[PDB]
């Protein structure tokens, strides 16, 4: 009785939200950006190849200096690379080799990683002993750790396969806020440029916008047909792009609270593993299961170019803060740095 | 054309590669085994004989084994099952005494049939096309006792064989091995274990050695 009545009210609320979004869908992003000229053909060459990982690379993250990056592989090794010289700065042996994510702190003093061990380990890079040591192991998640992002040296947000995201206090080792509401495994998260909000994508084909301080879900974004594997905020923080297993990328707007554009091709039938934006946001780079990385025109939904330099899945990619280069990691155990030429 | 500290930084990187090469050589000589099965199917007993992922290390006749137990994860299997692509073999545990039992959660699904669907998905999985399977059939002593009271007809309606233990045990083994839709790329090693058995580790060593040798014969191009 009460349960049946309540679930009918939920449908009414869903219809109210759908009508509200349809009311403000006066135009399409494609129509608005039809007049502007295309970006042309985007040609990028492999400037560097980072060798030394002996297994599938699952994650990478640039440092804020746009020169150092950390990559994670399931050979149980965290490696910090000098991208300019390809020198290895550090090699961190992991206690658990089943790592799935890695993050570089914006200060550069810490790195984080975690996987099937359900633990987010924090590593101190600046020690008087001259070696990298574990500073914290964040326990509390009941599923595998899929993504992690630092807010500062003391706060980090982690998403797990137990359908929840958490905000952690590194000094005390306790999760100050828990973000619940996803009905599937949360696979990725992206921080807003002001680090006051973050979006997360789960296997329920939905993306939720979370308030860090308040600790509740502000908005929910649907439209994908399969699990969301990747998510990335637009550089101005008013939009984000997702990547799913249905071979599509979608651009959602926070203020319009709906999808604006779909990035799919008939030839593409494989899942998407990673997505990122260029510095101006005009280019959307997505990694695919078909061993390639496709560069999309964000405004016009045109495939600007293809990065084909890997012999296995492109599992991760990232663009530097200055926008100078893009790094792609892959299951073939190599990292490559790409940029164009005049 | 490098500075004094640049030439020293390159030397540091060269030493890192030397340690990475040595760790890769050491890791390539270790046998990695993915342990699977259903809950309360003898899997825990196997580990003794030998909140995320539980890893067990043991050595048998100058061979180091790594056993990965992933039964404590309730998340989506397809989001992390590709992480084990490349293990030497899969150790699958099936409880023979659970042929007439009913799954506790579903309350209407046969327990033995729940193992077949788990075995069928793992054996035919795209990530384990070339990975052999070591099938352990536990609780053989308790299976014989339940045979006298509860016949095998409950589990398999189309079972016209005799009610003897040897006929019943062999029929179950054939059904599991018939779920292998790729009988050329991979091989299934079946062993009947028990609580008091002590040769289970030996069978793993024999099966792992058979897999390792047949991997070399493919690398050499003679097979």
């Amino acid at each position, epitope marked *: 009785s009460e349960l049946d009545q309540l679930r009918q009210e939920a449908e009414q609320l869903k219809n109210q939200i759908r009508d509200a979004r349809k009311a403000c869908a006066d135009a399409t992003l494609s129509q608005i950006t039809n007049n502007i000229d295309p970006v042309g053909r985007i040609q990028m060459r492999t400037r560097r190849t980072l060798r030394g990982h002996l297994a599938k690379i699952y994650a990478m993250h640039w440092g804020t200096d746009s020169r150092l990056l950390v990559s994670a592989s399931q050979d149980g090794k965290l490696i910090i690379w000098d991208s300019y010289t390809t020198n290895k700065v550090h090699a961190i042996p992991l206690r658990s080799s089943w790592v799935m994510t890695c993050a570089y702190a914006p200060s550069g003093n810490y790195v984080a990683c975690g996987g099937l061990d359900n633990i987010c380990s924090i590593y101190n890079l600046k020690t008087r002993e001259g070696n990298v040591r574990v500073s914290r192991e964040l326990a509390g998640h009941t599923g595998y750790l899929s993504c992690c992002r630092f807010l500062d040296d003391n706060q980090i947000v982690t998403s797990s396969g137990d359908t929840t995201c958490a905000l952690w206090d590194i000094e005390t080792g306790q999760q100050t806020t828990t973000f619940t509401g996803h009905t599937g495994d949360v696979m990725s998260l992206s921080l807003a440029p002001d680090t006051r909000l973050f979006v997360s994508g789960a296997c329920d084909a939905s993306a939720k916008l979370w308030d860090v301080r308040e600790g509740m879900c502000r908005q929910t974004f649907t439209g994908h047909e399969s699990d969301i594997n990747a998510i990335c905020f637009f550089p101005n923080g008013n939009a984000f792009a997702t990547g799913s297993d249905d071979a599509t990328c979608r651009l959602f707007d926070l203020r319009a609270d709906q999808e604006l554009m779909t990035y799919s091709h008939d030839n593409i039938i494989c899942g998407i593993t990673s997505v990122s934006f260029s510095k101006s946001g005009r280019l959307l780079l997505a990694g695919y299961d078909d061993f390639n990385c496709n560069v999309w025109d964000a405004l016009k939904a045109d495939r600007a170019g293809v990065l084909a330099g890997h012999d296995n899945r492109v599992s991760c990619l990232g663009v530097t803060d200055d926008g100078m280069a893009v790094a792609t990691g892959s299951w073939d155990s190599f990292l490559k740095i790409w940029n164009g030429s005049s | 054309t490098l500075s004094a*500290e640049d030439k020293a930084a390159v030397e540091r990187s060269k*030493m890192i590669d030397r340690n990475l090469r040595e760790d890769g050589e050491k890791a390539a000589r270790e046998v990695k085994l993915l342990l699977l099965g259903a809950g309360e199917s003898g899997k825990n007993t196997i580990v003794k004989q030998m909140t995320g992922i539980v890893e067990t290390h043991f050595t048998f006749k100058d061979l180091h084994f790594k056993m990965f137990d992933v039964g404590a994860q309730r998340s989506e299997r397809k989001k992390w099952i590709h992480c084990f692509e490349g293990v030497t073999a899969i150790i699958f545990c099936v409880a023979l005494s659970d042929y007439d039992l009913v799954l506790a959660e579903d309350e209407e699904m046969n327990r033995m049939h729940a193992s077949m669907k788990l075995f069928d998905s793992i054996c035919n999985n795209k990530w384990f096309t070339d990975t052999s399977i070591i099938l352990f059939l536990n609780k053989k002593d308790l299976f014989e006792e339940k045979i006298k009271k509860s016949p095998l007809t409950i589990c398999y309606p189309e079972y016209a064989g005799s009610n003897t233990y040897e006929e019943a045990a062999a029929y179950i083994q054939c059904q599991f091995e018939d779920l292998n839709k790729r009988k050329d790329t991979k091989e299934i090693y079946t062993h009947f274990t028990c609580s008091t058995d002590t040769k289970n580790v030996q069978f793993v060593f024999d099966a792992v050695t058979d897999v390792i040798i047949k991997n070399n014969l493919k690398d050499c191009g003679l097979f």
Partner: single-chain antibody
Amino acid sequence: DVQLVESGGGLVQPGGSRKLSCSASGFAFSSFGMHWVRQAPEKGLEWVAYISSGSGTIYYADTVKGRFTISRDDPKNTLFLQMTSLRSEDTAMYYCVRSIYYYGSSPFDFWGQGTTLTVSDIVMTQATSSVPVTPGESVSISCRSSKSLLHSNGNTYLYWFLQRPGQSPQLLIYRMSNLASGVPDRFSGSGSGTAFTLTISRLEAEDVGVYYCMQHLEYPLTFGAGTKLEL
């Protein structure tokens, strides 16, 4: 804590041999390159030898090459300096210095207490030998090099050290601008090309001492004469 204890020094006859030891504790010794730096009585610092991490690279000063042998024992965390044909010119306090080299590292960050031995090229110039100072007042120290220390990679390999009376040298500024860990922010290093300045705002009693500028652009590493601050 990080410690570097030297031993083996003492009074030796000319032409003799002596073995210096440097025991390291509290840090990953095998990850750090090691230097020997000596200081003659009432004189400045002089670089002696260098052995890299992993013992793959070894350098010697011209004044000691062929007579001194530097070696390390990584399992025992001990650094050695085998000396032969000792001359009266070798009478100095020998310091054990650790230095690690990677992107963003701070070489020469920790110095040992030193051991005393008594026997019976880019030019770095510090023209101002002494500077009378008062607490709370800003002081500038100048250093010059015969060659440009700015490399094509953007780094300027200039280092600043402070040797308080009775104490071992301490790193203040590495690569001409970066401030060493544990050093107050009042110290600042500024330079360009061949001319460099160390500015000390709001001088305090602890800042009193001798300041040395060292170049790390290429071997042999050379030190300036040193500028002494006195009240």
